[PDB]
Coordinates of C-alpha atoms and ligand atoms in Angstrom, one line a residue:
Chain L
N1 CA -8.0 -17.0 49.7
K2 CA -9.8 -13.7 49.9
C3 CA -9.3 -10.2 48.6
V4 CA -8.4 -8.3 51.7
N5 CA -6.7 -5.2 53.0
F6 CA -3.9 -6.3 55.3
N7 CA -1.0 -5.0 57.5
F8 CA 2.0 -7.2 58.1
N9 CA 4.3 -5.6 60.7
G10 CA 3.6 -2.2 59.3
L11 CA 3.6 -3.4 55.7
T12 CA 0.1 -2.7 54.5
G13 CA -1.4 -4.0 51.3
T14 CA -4.4 -5.6 49.6
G15 CA -4.7 -8.9 47.7
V16 CA -5.1 -12.6 48.2
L17 CA -2.6 -14.6 50.2
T18 CA -2.0 -18.4 49.9
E19 CA 0.1 -21.1 51.6
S20 CA 3.4 -21.1 49.7
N21 CA 6.2 -23.6 49.6
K22 CA 8.7 -20.7 49.4
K23 CA 11.8 -20.9 51.7
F24 CA 12.7 -17.6 53.3
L25 CA 15.8 -17.2 55.3
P26 CA 15.4 -17.2 59.1
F27 CA 15.7 -13.4 59.1
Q28 CA 14.1 -12.4 55.7
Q29 CA 10.8 -10.6 56.0
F30 CA 9.1 -10.3 52.6
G31 CA 10.0 -11.1 49.0
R32 CA 9.3 -8.7 46.1
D33 CA 8.5 -9.7 42.6
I34 CA 10.0 -8.0 39.6
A35 CA 9.0 -4.3 39.9
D36 CA 9.9 -4.7 43.6
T37 CA 6.2 -5.0 44.4
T38 CA 5.2 -7.1 47.4
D39 CA 5.5 -10.8 46.4
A40 CA 4.6 -12.8 49.5
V41 CA 4.8 -12.8 53.2
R42 CA 6.1 -15.0 56.0
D43 CA 3.4 -14.6 58.7
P44 CA 5.0 -13.3 61.9
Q45 CA 3.0 -14.9 64.7
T46 CA 4.1 -18.3 63.3
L47 CA 6.8 -17.1 60.9
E48 CA 5.3 -19.1 58.0
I49 CA 5.7 -18.4 54.3
Chain S
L1 CA 35.5 -1.5 39.2
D2 CA 36.4 -3.0 35.9
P3 CA 34.5 -1.9 32.8
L4 CA 33.5 -5.4 31.7
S5 CA 31.3 -4.9 34.7
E6 CA 30.5 -1.3 33.9
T7 CA 28.4 -2.9 31.2
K8 CA 27.2 -6.0 33.0
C9 CA 24.8 -4.1 35.3
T10 CA 23.9 -1.9 32.5
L11 CA 22.5 -4.9 30.7
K12 CA 22.1 -6.6 34.0
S13 CA 23.7 -9.8 32.7
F14 CA 26.5 -11.9 34.1
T15 CA 27.3 -12.8 30.5
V16 CA 28.1 -10.5 27.5
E17 CA 27.3 -11.5 24.0
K18 CA 29.9 -11.2 21.3
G19 CA 29.4 -7.7 20.0
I20 CA 29.6 -4.2 21.5
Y21 CA 27.5 -2.1 23.8
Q22 CA 27.5 1.4 25.3
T23 CA 27.5 2.4 28.9
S24 CA 28.4 6.0 29.8
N25 CA 29.8 9.3 28.5
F26 CA 33.1 11.0 28.7
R27 CA 33.4 14.7 29.5
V28 CA 36.5 16.4 30.8
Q29 CA 36.4 18.0 34.2
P30 CA 37.4 21.6 34.4
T31 CA 39.8 23.5 36.7
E32 CA 41.4 26.8 37.5
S33 CA 38.2 28.9 37.5
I34 CA 38.9 32.3 36.0
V35 CA 37.5 35.8 36.2
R36 CA 39.1 38.7 34.3
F37 CA 37.0 41.9 34.5
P38 CA 37.9 45.2 32.7
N39 CA 40.6 47.6 33.6
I40 CA 39.5 49.0 37.0
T41 CA 40.1 52.7 36.2
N42 CA 36.9 54.7 37.1
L43 CA 36.8 55.1 40.9
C44 CA 34.8 56.9 43.6
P45 CA 35.8 60.1 45.5
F46 CA 37.0 58.7 48.8
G47 CA 40.2 60.6 49.3
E48 CA 38.1 63.8 48.7
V49 CA 36.1 62.3 51.6
Chain K
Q1 CA -5.1 -13.4 8.1
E2 CA -3.4 -11.4 5.4
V3 CA -0.3 -13.7 5.6
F4 CA -1.2 -17.2 6.5
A5 CA -5.0 -17.3 5.7
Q6 CA -5.0 -16.7 1.9
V7 CA -6.8 -19.9 1.0
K8 CA -10.4 -20.7 2.0
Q9 CA -10.3 -24.5 1.7
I10 CA -8.2 -26.6 4.0
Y11 CA -6.5 -29.5 2.3
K12 CA -4.6 -32.5 3.6
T13 CA -2.0 -35.0 2.5
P14 CA -2.5 -38.6 1.7
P15 CA -0.5 -41.4 3.5
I16 CA 1.1 -42.4 0.2
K17 CA 4.2 -40.1 0.1
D18 CA 5.3 -41.7 -3.2
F19 CA 5.9 -38.1 -4.2
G20 CA 8.6 -38.8 -6.8
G21 CA 11.4 -39.9 -4.5
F22 CA 11.6 -37.1 -2.0
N23 CA 11.1 -37.4 1.8
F24 CA 8.9 -34.4 2.8
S25 CA 8.3 -36.0 6.2
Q26 CA 10.5 -33.5 8.0
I27 CA 7.9 -30.8 7.2
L28 CA 4.6 -32.8 7.1
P29 CA 2.6 -33.1 10.3
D30 CA 3.4 -35.6 13.0
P31 CA 0.3 -37.8 13.7
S32 CA 1.9 -38.6 17.1
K33 CA 0.7 -35.0 17.8
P34 CA 3.4 -33.1 19.5
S35 CA 0.7 -30.5 19.1
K36 CA 0.0 -31.5 15.4
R37 CA 3.1 -29.5 14.5
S38 CA 6.0 -30.5 12.3
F39 CA 9.6 -31.3 13.1
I40 CA 11.2 -28.2 11.5
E41 CA 8.4 -26.4 13.3
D42 CA 8.6 -27.7 16.8
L43 CA 12.3 -26.8 17.1
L44 CA 11.2 -23.3 16.2
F45 CA 8.9 -23.2 19.2
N46 CA 11.3 -24.8 21.7
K47 CA 14.4 -23.1 20.3
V48 CA 12.5 -19.9 21.3
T49 CA 11.2 -18.9 24.7
Chain D
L1 CA -1.0 -24.3 2.4
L2 CA 1.4 -27.1 1.8
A3 CA -1.1 -29.8 1.1
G4 CA -1.5 -28.3 -2.3
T5 CA 1.9 -27.0 -3.0
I6 CA 3.1 -30.5 -3.2
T7 CA -0.1 -32.0 -4.4
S8 CA -1.7 -29.4 -6.6
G9 CA 1.5 -27.8 -7.6
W10 CA 0.4 -24.2 -7.8
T11 CA -3.1 -24.5 -9.2
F12 CA -4.5 -23.9 -5.7
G13 CA -4.3 -20.1 -6.0
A14 CA -6.2 -19.5 -9.2
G15 CA -9.3 -21.5 -8.4
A16 CA -9.9 -25.2 -7.9
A17 CA -7.1 -27.7 -6.9
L18 CA -5.8 -29.4 -10.0
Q19 CA -3.4 -32.1 -9.1
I20 CA 0.0 -33.1 -10.4
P21 CA 2.7 -35.6 -9.4
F22 CA 5.4 -33.2 -8.3
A23 CA 7.6 -34.7 -11.0
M24 CA 5.7 -33.1 -13.8
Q25 CA 5.6 -30.2 -11.4
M26 CA 9.3 -29.6 -11.0
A27 CA 9.3 -30.4 -14.7
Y28 CA 7.6 -27.0 -15.1
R29 CA 9.2 -25.0 -12.4
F30 CA 12.3 -25.6 -14.4
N31 CA 10.6 -24.4 -17.6
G32 CA 10.5 -21.0 -15.9
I33 CA 14.1 -20.6 -14.9
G34 CA 15.3 -21.6 -18.4
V35 CA 16.0 -25.3 -18.1
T36 CA 14.6 -27.9 -20.5
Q37 CA 12.4 -30.6 -19.0
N38 CA 15.1 -33.2 -19.6
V39 CA 17.4 -31.8 -16.9
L40 CA 15.0 -33.0 -14.3
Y41 CA 13.7 -36.3 -15.5
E42 CA 17.1 -37.4 -16.6
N43 CA 18.8 -36.3 -13.4
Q44 CA 15.9 -36.9 -10.9
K45 CA 17.6 -38.9 -8.2
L46 CA 20.6 -36.6 -8.2
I47 CA 18.0 -33.9 -7.8
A48 CA 16.3 -36.0 -5.2
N49 CA 19.2 -36.9 -3.0
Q50 CA 19.9 -33.2 -3.1
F51 CA 16.5 -32.0 -1.9
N52 CA 16.6 -34.5 0.9
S53 CA 20.1 -33.7 2.0
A54 CA 19.1 -30.0 1.7
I55 CA 16.9 -30.2 4.7
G56 CA 19.0 -32.0 7.3
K57 CA 21.5 -29.3 6.7
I58 CA 18.7 -27.0 7.8
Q59 CA 17.9 -29.2 10.8
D60 CA 21.3 -28.5 12.3
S61 CA 20.9 -24.8 11.7
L62 CA 17.6 -24.6 13.4
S63 CA 18.3 -27.6 15.7
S64 CA 21.9 -26.9 16.6
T65 CA 22.7 -23.3 15.7
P66 CA 21.3 -20.5 17.9
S67 CA 21.3 -16.9 16.7
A68 CA 19.5 -18.2 13.6
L69 CA 16.1 -16.9 14.8
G70 CA 17.2 -13.4 15.9
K71 CA 14.7 -11.0 14.5
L72 CA 11.7 -12.7 15.9
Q73 CA 13.4 -12.3 19.3
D74 CA 14.5 -8.7 18.9
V75 CA 10.8 -8.1 18.6
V76 CA 9.8 -10.1 21.7
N77 CA 12.6 -8.5 23.7
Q78 CA 11.5 -4.9 23.0
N79 CA 7.7 -5.4 23.5
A80 CA 8.5 -7.0 26.8
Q81 CA 11.3 -4.6 27.6
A82 CA 9.4 -1.4 27.2
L83 CA 6.7 -3.1 29.2
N84 CA 8.8 -3.5 32.3
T85 CA 9.9 0.0 31.6
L86 CA 6.3 0.9 32.1
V87 CA 6.0 -1.2 35.2
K88 CA 9.1 0.4 36.6
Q89 CA 8.3 4.0 36.2
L90 CA 5.6 3.5 38.8
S91 CA 8.3 3.9 41.4
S92 CA 9.7 7.2 40.1
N93 CA 8.2 9.9 42.3
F94 CA 8.0 12.2 39.3
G95 CA 8.4 15.0 41.8
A96 CA 6.7 14.1 45.1
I97 CA 7.2 12.7 48.6
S98 CA 6.8 9.2 47.0
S99 CA 5.7 7.1 44.1
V100 CA 3.1 5.4 46.3
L101 CA -0.4 6.9 46.5
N102 CA -2.3 5.5 49.4
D103 CA 0.5 6.7 51.6
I104 CA 0.6 10.3 50.3
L105 CA -3.1 10.5 51.2
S106 CA -2.5 8.9 54.5
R107 CA 0.1 11.5 55.5
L108 CA -1.4 14.9 54.7
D109 CA -4.6 16.8 54.1
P110 CA -6.2 17.1 50.6
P111 CA -4.8 20.5 49.4
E112 CA -1.2 19.4 49.0
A113 CA -2.3 15.7 48.8
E114 CA -4.0 16.9 45.7
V115 CA -1.0 18.7 44.1
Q116 CA 1.4 15.9 45.1
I117 CA -0.9 13.7 43.1
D118 CA -1.3 16.4 40.5
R119 CA 2.4 15.9 39.7
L120 CA 2.6 12.2 39.9
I121 CA 0.0 12.2 37.2
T122 CA 1.9 14.7 35.0
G123 CA 4.6 12.2 34.4
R124 CA 2.6 8.9 34.2
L125 CA 0.4 10.1 31.4
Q126 CA 3.7 11.2 30.0
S127 CA 5.0 7.8 30.8
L128 CA 2.1 6.2 29.0
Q129 CA 2.0 8.3 25.9
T130 CA 5.7 7.5 25.6
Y131 CA 5.2 3.7 25.7
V132 CA 2.3 4.1 23.4
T133 CA 4.2 6.0 20.7
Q134 CA 6.8 3.3 21.1
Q135 CA 4.1 0.7 20.6
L136 CA 2.4 2.2 17.6
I137 CA 5.6 2.4 15.6
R138 CA 6.9 -1.0 16.6
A139 CA 3.4 -2.1 15.6
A140 CA 3.5 -0.2 12.3
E141 CA 6.9 -1.7 11.3
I142 CA 5.7 -5.2 12.1
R143 CA 3.0 -4.5 9.6
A144 CA 5.5 -3.8 6.8
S145 CA 6.8 -7.3 7.6
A146 CA 3.3 -8.6 7.1
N147 CA 2.0 -6.9 4.0
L148 CA 5.4 -8.1 2.8
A149 CA 5.0 -11.7 3.9
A150 CA 1.4 -11.6 2.6
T151 CA 3.1 -10.7 -0.7
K152 CA 5.7 -13.5 -0.2
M153 CA 3.2 -16.3 0.5
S154 CA 1.1 -15.0 -2.3
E155 CA 4.1 -15.4 -4.7
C156 CA 6.9 -17.5 -3.4
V157 CA 4.7 -20.2 -1.9
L158 CA 1.6 -20.2 -4.1
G159 CA 3.8 -20.1 -7.1
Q160 CA 7.0 -19.1 -8.9
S161 CA 8.5 -15.6 -8.7
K162 CA 11.1 -14.5 -11.2
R163 CA 12.1 -11.7 -9.0
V164 CA 15.8 -12.0 -8.2
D165 CA 16.3 -11.9 -4.5
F166 CA 12.7 -12.2 -3.5
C167 CA 12.3 -15.9 -2.8
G168 CA 16.0 -15.9 -2.1
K169 CA 19.2 -16.6 -3.9
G170 CA 18.9 -18.2 -7.3
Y171 CA 16.3 -18.8 -10.0
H172 CA 13.5 -19.9 -7.7
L173 CA 11.8 -23.2 -8.2
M174 CA 9.4 -23.5 -5.3
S175 CA 9.2 -22.0 -1.8
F176 CA 7.8 -24.0 1.2
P177 CA 6.6 -22.4 4.4
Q178 CA 6.5 -23.4 8.0
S179 CA 5.1 -21.4 10.9
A180 CA 6.3 -19.9 14.2
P181 CA 5.1 -18.2 17.4
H182 CA 4.6 -14.7 16.1
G183 CA 5.9 -15.1 12.6
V184 CA 6.8 -17.4 9.8
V185 CA 10.0 -19.0 8.5
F186 CA 10.2 -19.8 4.8
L187 CA 12.1 -22.6 3.2
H188 CA 13.1 -21.3 -0.2
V189 CA 14.5 -23.9 -2.6
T190 CA 16.4 -22.6 -5.5
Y191 CA 18.7 -23.5 -8.4
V192 CA 22.5 -22.9 -8.3
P193 CA 24.7 -23.5 -11.3
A194 CA 27.9 -25.5 -10.6
Chain E
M1 CA 20.4 9.4 7.5
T2 CA 22.8 10.9 9.9
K3 CA 23.1 9.1 13.2
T4 CA 22.7 11.3 16.2
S5 CA 23.5 10.2 19.8
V6 CA 22.8 12.2 22.8
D7 CA 23.8 12.5 26.5
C8 CA 20.6 13.4 28.2
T9 CA 22.2 14.3 31.5
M10 CA 24.2 16.8 29.4
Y11 CA 21.2 18.4 27.7
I12 CA 18.6 18.7 30.4
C13 CA 21.0 19.7 33.0
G14 CA 24.3 21.1 31.6
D15 CA 26.9 20.1 34.1
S16 CA 25.0 21.3 37.2
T17 CA 25.2 18.5 39.7
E18 CA 22.1 20.0 41.3
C19 CA 20.0 19.1 38.3
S20 CA 20.8 15.5 37.7
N21 CA 20.0 15.0 41.4
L22 CA 16.4 15.8 40.3
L23 CA 16.2 13.7 37.1
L24 CA 16.8 10.5 39.1
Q25 CA 13.3 10.8 40.4
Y26 CA 11.8 12.0 37.1
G27 CA 12.7 8.3 36.4
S28 CA 14.3 6.5 33.5
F29 CA 13.0 8.5 30.6
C30 CA 16.7 9.5 30.2
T31 CA 17.7 6.0 29.1
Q32 CA 14.9 5.2 26.8
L33 CA 15.3 8.4 24.8
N34 CA 18.7 7.0 24.0
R35 CA 17.8 3.4 23.5
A36 CA 15.4 4.5 20.8
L37 CA 18.2 6.5 19.2
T38 CA 20.7 3.7 19.2
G39 CA 18.1 1.3 17.8
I40 CA 18.1 3.8 14.9
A41 CA 21.8 4.0 14.5
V42 CA 22.0 0.2 14.2
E43 CA 19.4 0.1 11.4
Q44 CA 20.3 3.1 9.4
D45 CA 23.6 1.3 9.1
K46 CA 21.9 -2.0 8.3
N47 CA 20.0 -0.3 5.5
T48 CA 23.3 0.8 3.9
Chain Z
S1 CA -30.6 -16.2 19.7
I2 CA -26.8 -16.3 20.2
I3 CA -24.1 -18.9 19.8
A4 CA -20.4 -19.4 20.7
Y5 CA -18.3 -21.7 18.5
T6 CA -14.8 -22.7 17.5
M7 CA -13.7 -21.3 14.2
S8 CA -14.2 -23.2 10.9
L9 CA -11.3 -22.8 8.5
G10 CA -13.1 -24.3 5.6
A11 CA -14.2 -27.5 3.9
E12 CA -11.8 -30.4 4.6
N13 CA -11.1 -31.7 1.1
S14 CA -8.7 -34.3 -0.2
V15 CA -7.0 -34.7 -3.6
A16 CA -6.2 -37.8 -5.6
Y17 CA -2.5 -37.6 -5.9
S18 CA -0.9 -40.4 -7.8
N19 CA 2.1 -40.9 -10.0
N20 CA -0.3 -41.2 -12.9
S21 CA -2.9 -38.5 -12.3
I22 CA -3.4 -35.0 -13.6
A23 CA -6.4 -32.7 -14.0
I24 CA -7.1 -30.1 -16.7
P25 CA -10.0 -27.8 -17.2
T26 CA -12.3 -27.7 -20.2
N27 CA -14.2 -24.4 -19.9
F28 CA -12.9 -21.2 -18.5
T29 CA -14.7 -18.6 -16.3
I30 CA -14.1 -15.0 -15.6
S31 CA -14.2 -13.2 -12.3
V32 CA -14.2 -9.5 -11.3
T33 CA -13.0 -8.3 -8.0
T34 CA -12.4 -5.2 -5.9
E35 CA -9.2 -4.2 -4.2
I36 CA -10.1 -0.9 -2.5
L37 CA -7.1 1.1 -1.4
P38 CA -6.8 4.6 0.0
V39 CA -4.9 7.5 -1.5
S40 CA -5.8 10.7 0.2
Chain H
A1 CA -0.8 4.5 -1.3
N2 CA 2.5 3.6 -3.0
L3 CA 1.3 0.1 -3.2
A4 CA -1.8 1.6 -4.8
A5 CA 0.6 3.5 -7.0
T6 CA 2.4 0.3 -8.1
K7 CA -0.8 -1.4 -9.2
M8 CA -1.8 1.4 -11.6
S9 CA 1.8 1.0 -12.8
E10 CA 1.8 -2.8 -12.9
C11 CA -1.7 -4.2 -13.0
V12 CA -3.6 -1.5 -14.8
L13 CA -1.0 -0.4 -17.3
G14 CA 0.0 -4.0 -17.9
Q15 CA 0.0 -7.6 -17.1
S16 CA 1.8 -9.3 -14.2
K17 CA 2.5 -13.0 -13.7
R18 CA 2.4 -12.3 -10.0
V19 CA -0.4 -13.8 -8.0
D20 CA -2.6 -11.9 -5.5
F21 CA -1.1 -8.6 -6.6
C22 CA -3.5 -7.9 -9.5
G23 CA -6.3 -9.9 -8.0
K24 CA -7.3 -13.5 -7.6
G25 CA -6.5 -15.6 -10.6
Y26 CA -4.2 -15.6 -13.6
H27 CA -4.3 -11.9 -14.4
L28 CA -5.6 -10.7 -17.7
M29 CA -6.2 -7.0 -17.2
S30 CA -7.2 -4.5 -14.6
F31 CA -9.6 -1.6 -15.2
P32 CA -9.5 1.1 -12.6
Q33 CA -12.0 3.7 -11.4
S34 CA -12.1 6.5 -8.9
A35 CA -13.2 7.2 -5.3
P36 CA -13.7 10.2 -3.1
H37 CA -10.5 9.7 -1.2
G38 CA -9.1 6.6 -2.7
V39 CA -8.7 4.4 -5.7
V40 CA -10.4 1.3 -6.9
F41 CA -9.0 -1.4 -9.1
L42 CA -11.3 -3.9 -11.0
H43 CA -9.2 -7.0 -11.7
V44 CA -10.3 -9.3 -14.5
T45 CA -9.0 -12.8 -14.2
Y46 CA -9.1 -16.4 -15.2
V47 CA -10.9 -18.9 -13.1
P48 CA -10.7 -22.5 -14.3
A49 CA -13.6 -25.0 -13.9
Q50 CA -15.3 -27.9 -15.5
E51 CA -12.3 -30.1 -14.6
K52 CA -11.6 -33.6 -15.9
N53 CA -9.5 -36.5 -14.6
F54 CA -6.8 -37.6 -17.0
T55 CA -3.9 -40.0 -16.8
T56 CA -0.3 -39.0 -17.3
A57 CA 3.1 -40.2 -18.3
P58 CA 5.7 -37.5 -19.0
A59 CA 7.7 -39.1 -21.8
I60 CA 7.0 -41.6 -24.6
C61 CA 9.0 -44.4 -26.2
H62 CA 9.5 -45.0 -29.9
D63 CA 12.4 -46.4 -31.9
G64 CA 13.8 -47.0 -28.5
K65 CA 14.1 -43.2 -28.3
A66 CA 12.6 -40.8 -25.8
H67 CA 10.6 -37.7 -26.9
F68 CA 9.5 -34.9 -24.7
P69 CA 7.0 -32.0 -25.3
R70 CA 7.5 -28.3 -25.9
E71 CA 4.6 -26.6 -24.3
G72 CA 2.0 -28.6 -22.5
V73 CA 1.8 -32.1 -21.3
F74 CA 0.9 -35.7 -22.2
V75 CA -2.4 -37.4 -21.2
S76 CA -4.4 -40.5 -22.1
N77 CA -8.1 -41.4 -22.0
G78 CA -8.0 -45.2 -21.8
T79 CA -6.2 -46.3 -25.0
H80 CA -5.1 -43.2 -26.8
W81 CA -2.5 -40.6 -25.9
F82 CA -2.6 -36.9 -26.6
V83 CA -0.8 -33.6 -26.0
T84 CA -2.2 -30.4 -24.7
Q85 CA -1.5 -27.3 -22.7
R86 CA -1.5 -27.0 -19.0
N87 CA -4.4 -24.7 -18.5
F88 CA -6.9 -25.8 -21.2
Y89 CA -8.0 -29.1 -22.8
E90 CA -7.9 -28.9 -26.6
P91 CA -6.1 -32.1 -27.4
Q92 CA -3.9 -32.9 -30.3
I93 CA -2.3 -35.9 -32.0
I94 CA 1.3 -36.3 -31.1
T95 CA 3.8 -35.3 -33.8
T96 CA 7.5 -35.0 -34.5
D97 CA 6.7 -31.2 -34.3
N98 CA 5.0 -30.8 -30.9
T99 CA 7.8 -32.7 -29.2
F100 CA 11.5 -33.4 -29.1
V101 CA 14.0 -36.1 -28.4
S102 CA 16.9 -36.5 -26.0
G103 CA 18.4 -39.7 -24.8
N104 CA 17.3 -43.3 -24.6
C105 CA 13.9 -44.2 -23.1
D106 CA 15.3 -46.6 -20.4
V107 CA 15.9 -44.0 -17.7
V108 CA 12.9 -41.7 -17.4
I109 CA 10.3 -43.1 -15.0
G110 CA 6.6 -43.4 -15.4
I111 CA 7.0 -43.7 -19.2
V112 CA 4.4 -45.3 -21.4
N113 CA 5.3 -46.9 -24.8
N114 CA 3.3 -45.4 -27.6
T115 CA 3.4 -44.6 -31.3
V116 CA 4.0 -41.4 -33.2
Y117 CA 2.4 -40.0 -36.3
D118 CA 5.1 -38.1 -38.3
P119 CA 3.9 -35.8 -41.0
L120 CA 6.6 -36.5 -43.6
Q121 CA 6.4 -40.1 -44.7
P122 CA 3.0 -40.0 -46.5
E123 CA 4.2 -36.8 -48.1
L124 CA 6.8 -39.2 -49.6
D125 CA 4.1 -41.7 -50.6
Ligands
NAG1 C1 42.4 63.2 47.8 C2 43.7 62.9 48.5 O1 44.6 63.7 48.4 N1 43.8 61.8 49.2 C3 45.0 61.4 49.9 C4 46.1 61.0 48.9 O2 46.4 62.1 48.1 C5 47.3 60.5 49.7 O3 48.3 60.1 48.8 C6 46.9 59.4 50.6 C7 48.1 59.0 51.5 O4 48.2 59.9 52.6 O5 45.9 59.8 51.5 C8 44.7 60.2 50.8
NAG2 C1 3.0 -45.7 -9.1 O1 2.6 -45.9 -7.8 C2 2.1 -47.3 -7.5 C3 1.5 -47.2 -6.1 O2 0.2 -46.7 -6.1 C4 3.3 -48.2 -7.7 O3 2.8 -49.6 -7.5 C5 3.8 -48.1 -9.1 O4 5.0 -48.9 -9.2 C6 4.2 -46.7 -9.4 N1 4.7 -46.6 -10.8 C7 5.1 -45.4 -11.3 C8 5.6 -45.5 -12.7 O5 5.1 -44.4 -10.7

């Protein structure tokens, strides 16, 4: 819940993250909204969406 | 593979309205490249060399 | 404004729809307030997305 | 706009709202088409059970039949379509090592990092001017729909229009409106000899 | 008015496979310029 | 000072519809208006 | 502009039963004048006022017959009945001239039994 500049496993971006009910697949890394922009992130060190 | 799908991903639908649509273009492919220069009849003096 | 806003005074309709025999209810508002819209209207809003 | 069409007939577009019972009203809207006043008072119910059966038939159309509200959608589709087309072009390098800026800076030194960007620009602005010129026009057209409608509500709804094929098919009696998301849909009631 | 319909990859490039391999990164302009031309051919018929 | 308000459409008025009610004027009145339109 | 060309071909050069095309109100005329880079149209019109509540009944009964009007309507003050036009009050006595007959007066609804002066009988007296 803060505007931030982040790097997730080499993926770098800025924005505000939030806890999300989304269900990735055990291998999937990051979802992209239409326009293929970064949509969300499963956080590595706990692998949470 | 089949053209009913040559469209589908053009429109990006797994359904196709009644009606028509347009996908691609036809254009024949060529062959038998040709070159026919003029009568080669003005030569250099090599035998005289 | 040029289309729907011709008048300047907002009128209303009495409860007594003894309007000569017709049943205009299918257009008049719905006091139950499905957004104060009419029947032949609401369809036009849900039948479109 | 309807609370006076029924009630005030059509006197609500020339000044104050003069009432009328909608029977004497149709009794006039017939005097325009070329029908004597009797043909209404002496055949009212048959005229009534027609008007009321005339709507349900429309219910089905707009309650059961899709494809009946096309044009209003062919407008939505475009405006949103070209939009994504603008969102999308932002991943077309337009002639550079990428379509992503922060990287291009984070990989080089200014000099080329400036021309790289000097190209990316030269297509975006071209991307925008394109969308725009596709958004003016489609916003001009929609006007002709409006100055038209504004001339339909002004005539068909607020009164009777003798113009054949303006308030629809037939000697027009009275046209009733209803609204919509981005537009209107009219209910034009007419006369049809049989 | 007469309906025209165009094959961008034919005009800009003229059967030089080299070219088209450049237009892919100049984006999707190629399509639109057609879509706006079909959207004409559909109407200038409707008008008639 | 300043204000922020929802938009007033007009004066809510009601009419006396009835199966036996009409209304007719007795004196007329003229109006003059302006419809400015561009040409050039 | 064309729209502004139609008005000086419809509203100025003539009369048009259309509303909101030659101004607000039942059109009567339209005097135009100029501009630097446009036109102006001065629309003269008809704005009703000084209303009055009346009571209606479309048709009338007499000799068991039903008579209707020709141009205008039927109203009544409390006891009398009169006929006049739809956009002005200048009432008249009902006659066999300003009306006409069709059918029996058992079907029309809202009717009100009345009498009819007829301008021939005394001319026989
Ligand atoms: C200028 C000249 O004579 N060139 C000669 C030619 O005449 C002869 O036919 C050929 C074959 O030996 O060799 C060369
Ligand atoms: C008129 O309406 C009243 C209700 O207000 C009703 O009682 C009466 O029967 C009606 N009569 C006619 C002729 O419309």
